[PDB]
Amino acid sequence: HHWGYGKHNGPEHWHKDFPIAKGERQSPVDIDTHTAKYDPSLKPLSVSYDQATSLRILNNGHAFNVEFDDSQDKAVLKGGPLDGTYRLIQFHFHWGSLDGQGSEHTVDKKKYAAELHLVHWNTKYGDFGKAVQQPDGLAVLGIFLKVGSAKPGLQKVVDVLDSIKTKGKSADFTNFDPRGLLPESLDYWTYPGSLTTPPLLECVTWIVLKEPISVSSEQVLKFRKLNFNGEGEPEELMVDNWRPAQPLKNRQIKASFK
Ligand SMILES: Cc1cc(=O)[nH]c(SCC(=O)c2ccc(S(N)(=O)=O)c(Cl)c2)n1
Ligand SMILES: [Zn+2]
């Protein structure tokens, strides 16, 4: 009876195994755009993904992860609100059963169809598993997806999903360029938070881009053909793998713009 996204093991249950679920800096949150503080001293975000080395794509039973070689400074995030260099380790998405929901962060209570998370770890801690035990260990770049025109840079991911339909499947996934998933503008909101899945550790500097990317209805439909179950088990479609907004508590969301 481990955690997941159903009636009996979904987000409202997680606090029984992971008490930090009711902690002081949990994510996601609703981003109230009117009360976000413009911080004229936040720097432009630096996204250096030219040398990125994707390796594999994996269905972990909660989402799919596209994994990167993080054993050197190839694909790094820095600047923005960050005081350190953070290496890309993986990205993944959260999405809905319907276009009207799917994102984890919300903007003035608006849900997007999905949300991309590019997970990076602070190089001062040497690897991901040590970084998540630190309050400044991770930087997650969050990007909203709306349904409209296709995202051509997404299509290589969508086309491999049928090879990783069920939990524990993986596939070689080399030479994927994550620059093809970024919107034009790097304007962002930022606040201190957590992983949005168990173990819900409070180790994340969130950086959420204001500009969503567009994906087509057919691209997101393909995400909804994945399965939470393993091969040979009863089919449970991988939809609605998002945690709802959590109390902001004693936190201020900062904006890099306007
Ligand atoms: C904290 C931890 C330690 C570990 O050894 N393995 C894992 S697997 C979960 C994981 O890496 C992860 C999942 C979701 C997120 S999210 N939705 O971007 O906040 C992150 Cl940052 C990380 N997590
Ligand atoms: Zn995530």
Swiss-Prot record:
Changing Y5H: Reduced proton transfer rate. Changing H62G: Impaired activity, not rescued by 4-methylimidazole (4-MI). It is found in: Cytoplasm; Cell membrane. GO terms for biological process: angiotensin-activated signaling pathway; carbon dioxide transport; morphogenesis of an epithelium; neuron cellular homeostasis; positive regulation of cellular pH reduction; positive regulation of dipeptide transmembrane transport; positive regulation of synaptic transmission, GABAergic; regulation of chloride transport. Changing V140 to F/Y: Strongly impaired activity. Belongs to the alpha-carbonic anhydrase family. The modification Phosphoserine is found at S163, S170. This is Carbonic anhydrase 2. It comes from Homo sapiens. Optimum pH is 6-8. Changing T197H: Higher affinity for bicarbonate. Enhanced proton transfer capacity. Changing V119 to A/G/I/L/S: Reduced CO(2) hydrase and p-nitrophenyl acetate esterase activities. Changing N65L: Reduced activity. Residues 1-257 form the Alpha-carbonic anhydrase domain. Its EC number is 4.2.1.1, 4.2.1.69. Changing P199A: Normal CO(2) hydrase activity, but impaired stability. The active site is at H62 (proton donor/acceptor). Substrate binds at T196, T197. Its main location: cytoplasm. Changing Y5F: Enhanced activity. Activated by X-ray, histamine, L-adrenaline, L- and D-phenylalanine, L- and D-histidine, L-His-OMe and beta-Ala-His (carnosine). The gene is CA2. Changing T196 to A/C/H/P: Strongly reduced activity. GO terms for cellular component: apical part of cell; cytoplasm; cytosol; extracellular exosome; myelin sheath; plasma membrane. Changing L195F: Normal activity.
